[PDB]
Amino acid sequence: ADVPAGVQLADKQTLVRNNGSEVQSLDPHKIEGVPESNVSRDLFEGLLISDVEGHPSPGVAEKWENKDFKVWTFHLRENAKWSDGTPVTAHDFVYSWQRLADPNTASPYASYLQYGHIANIDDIIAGKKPATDLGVKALDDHTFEVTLSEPVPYFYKLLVHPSVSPVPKSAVEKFGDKWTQPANIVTNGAYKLKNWVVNERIVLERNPQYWDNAKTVINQVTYLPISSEVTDVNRYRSGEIDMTYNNMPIELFQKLKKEIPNEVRVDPYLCTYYYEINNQKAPFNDVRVRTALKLALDRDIIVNKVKNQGDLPAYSYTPPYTDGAKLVEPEWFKWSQQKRNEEAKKLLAEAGFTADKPLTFDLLYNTSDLHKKLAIAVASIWKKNLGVNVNLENQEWKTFLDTRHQGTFDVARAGWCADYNEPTSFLNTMLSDSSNNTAHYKSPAFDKLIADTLKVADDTQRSELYAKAEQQLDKDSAIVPVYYYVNARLVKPWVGGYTGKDPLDNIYVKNLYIIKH
Q: CA–CA distance from 456 to each of 150, 327, 426, 449 (Å)?
């Protein structure tokens, strides 16, 4: 943390943050969500980290070079250490990236190494080659070298993500799935795990072995698992919570902007809220059905009437303000809602649905005040506009993500946030073989458009290809885009160091500080 000259620090440097739900895991290779990544950034540090404004900056690597954007060499700082005092070495990164790639680990982020094009990853994922054939090597204890199969100019931007953080081999090997318990875990970020009470709290304490420990200010941070946005706001206003999670309740938000304007932080955020359709299950394997659902949803009512938190109506998966996005707004988005409704009704009638044999399906969502109120609204809109009946089902976060990967569901509430600021952070998740593809969408035309992006060495051709890839996704109605999120959350006036400038919201508690109050 960089405390401005003249700010008076509180005697007690502790922080309580709400984190939306109970994490899936603390193992960097088993996680895929925001809550998970929030805790992961405080505990495990990769090659690079984001600075306080979100720019990729030195993490365990203090400096790096590339050769033709295909061979990347990372010089690791000599004083990087784990919490047990042992050095963090390039051997740790070699082991960790191989563990990520290995199919036996079954990471949801195994394809992150495909997104970066590390050599031999496709064969490794397919079990044709052992994980030790992965194109990574330790040239010495402080030098990690990565070899890609084609030039990737934005490669280094990927490296702040939890899936490419190191994990401690000796703890993993000795404790198996209990390696992350407080008595067993070993970490290399600014913090260490003190307590983990499922469905109550996660408490982290400063890691004195962290290389940049002298600049850490907060001594202890607690992450809570509250999925009710109303309750989070209530426990923030009671004094318990210093920073709410960044999901805001429909019940209270209008009042909050007028009651505590200065604490209501609203900033750009590279995330898209959408309804995920299970493309491999009838009747959702019919494009007419998917297009009808997409067109009949009225984004203006949802975004400006039922939610009104500053979100923008969406017509694509990749947010249009992602670095490198030059998207073409489809003609259906410019139409009136009545024109979209007739087309929707026309397509469903064409798909075989009638008043006596209507379309009836489930709308799965993770427990939340915000998601439940939006799903009830969407169910009413789809009933009014298209005559379809929806049965709402809530599931806790970890189970919800597992259900979507299991892929026998119908429609699910969804939302993807960028891992790096470039359109392929979204687009790669719709590849046929992506480990993150919970839409279960498989299009050879879409796959080809993305494969073509690194075969050109031109940003304009790349951007035109991303635009066409979005058009292909839209043409197939893989998903139902709803809105691009804003990052809205409450932050107490005494919490210093949170700029809101990072559109990825990669916060590190080592960057914050508590002002005297």
A: 11, 19, 19, 11
Taking alpha carbons only, the member of 164, 186, 6 closest to residue 74 is: 164
Q: Which residue in the block uniquely carries the two structure tokens 């990574």?
A: 136
Please state the φ and ψ torsions of residue 146, each to the nearest 5 degrees.
-115, 130
From CA 14, how far away is CA 432, in angstroms rounded? 45
Return the CATH fold of 271-486. Answer: Dipeptide-binding Protein; domain 3 (3.10.105)
- Rounded to whole angstroms, the Cα distance separating 210 from 43 reads 10
**Cα three-residue angle 484-363-472, rounded to 5 degrees:** 50
- Do 112 and 158 meet the contact criterion of CB atoms below 8 Å apart? yes
Write out the two tokens for 501: 């400038």
Query: Would you say 222 and 16 are in contact if contact means Cβ atoms under 8 Å apart?
Result: yes
For 434, the token pair is 């992506």
**In b/e form, how buried is each residue of 395-421, taking b as 16+ CB within 10 angstroms?**
bebbebbebbeeeebbbbbbbbbbbbb
Q: Where along the chain do its domains lie?
A: 1-44+169-270+487-517, 45-168, 271-486
- Of the candidates 76, 107, 78, the one whose C-alpha atom is nearest the C-alpha of residue 94 is 76
List the structure tokens of 171: 């703890």
Question: What's the resolution in A?
Answer: 1.8
CATH of domain 1-44+169-270+487-517: 3.40.190.10
Q: Which residues contact 239 (CB under 8 A, 6 or more apart)?
A: none
Bridge partner residues of 195 (DSSP): 203
* Cβ contacts of 94 within 8 Å, gap of 6 or more: 136, 137, 138, 144
Tell me if 111 sits within 8 A of 434, measured CB to CB: yes
| Domain 45-168 CATH class label | alpha beta
Contact yes or no for 507/42 (Cβ under 8 A): no
Secondary structure class of 17 (helix, strand, coil):
strand
Contacts of 434 by beta carbon, 8 Å cutoff, 6+ apart: 111, 114, 428
Compute the 3-state secondary structure of the chain and give helix, strand, coil in percent, each to the nearest 5.
Answer: 35, 20, 45
Please state how this structure was obtained.
X-ray
